[PDB]
Amino acid sequence: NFSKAMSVAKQVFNSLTEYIQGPCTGNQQSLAHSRLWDAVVGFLHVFAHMMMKLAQDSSQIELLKELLDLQKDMVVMLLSLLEGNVVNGMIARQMVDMLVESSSNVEMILK
């Protein structure tokens, strides 16, 4: 159910990555000013609560295994966006703003 819809988002992140997987500054610049930052902020909040709910559940493993793969494919796009960057870069500072908003969400993720 929710896993099937989530598996679709995995393909989108890989497709998004493949466009910028090489140092394509033209596609990187377009994604910087798009609504990509807003999408990840919502996704990060969902993943933080999804981990905790399945953590308490003993038999909720099949969704968790599918869940863990999604953010791993997400950060590759985040790394791809930072690929070829410069210090004080415009794209780099965009993540700084987005990390402030989702700073609470990234908490408890490491645990």
UniProtKB/Swiss-Prot annotation:
Free-text function comment from the UniProt entry: Cytosolic calcium-activated calcium channel that mediates the release of Ca(2+) from the sarcoplasmic reticulum into the cytosol and thereby plays a key role in triggering muscle contraction following depolarization of T-tubules. Repeated very high-level exercise increases the open probability of the channel and leads to Ca(2+) leaking into the cytoplasm. Can also mediate the release of Ca(2+) from intracellular stores in neurons, and may thereby promote prolonged Ca(2+) signaling in the brain. Required for normal embryonic development of muscle fibers and skeletal muscle.
Domain comment in the entry: The calcium release channel activity resides in the C-terminal region while the remaining part of the protein constitutes the 'foot' structure spanning the junctional gap between the sarcoplasmic reticulum (SR) and the T-tubule. Pore opening is mediated via the cytoplasmic calcium-binding domains that mediate a small rotation of the channel-forming transmembrane regions that then leads to channel opening.
The name this protein goes by in its record: Ryanodine receptor 1
Residues at which Ca(2+) binds: 18
Coiled coil, from the record: none
Subunit structure: Homotetramer. Can also form heterotetramers with RYR2. Identified in a complex composed of RYR1, PDE4D, PKA, FKBP1A and protein phosphatase 1 (PP1). Repeated very high-level exercise decreases interaction with PDE4D and protein phosphatase 1 (PP1). Interacts with CALM; CALM with bound calcium inhibits the RYR1 channel activity. Interacts with S100A1. Interacts with FKBP1A; this stabilizes the closed conformation of the channel. Interacts with CACNA1S; interaction with CACNA1S is important for activation of the RYR1 channel. Interacts with CACNB1.
Domain of life: Eukaryota
Cell compartment(s), UniProt: Sarcoplasmic reticulum membrane
Additional record remark: Binding of [3H]ryanodine indicates that the heterozygous channel is activated by Ca(2+) concentrations 4-fold lower than normal. Single-cell analysis of cotransfected cells shows a significantly increased resting cytoplasmic Ca(2+) level and a significantly reduced luminal Ca(2+) level.
PTM annotation: The N-terminus is blocked.
Tissues of expression: Detected in skeletal muscle (at protein level). Fast- or slow-twitch skeletal muscle.
Family (UniProt): Belongs to the ryanodine receptor (TC 1.A.3.1) family. RYR1 subfamily.
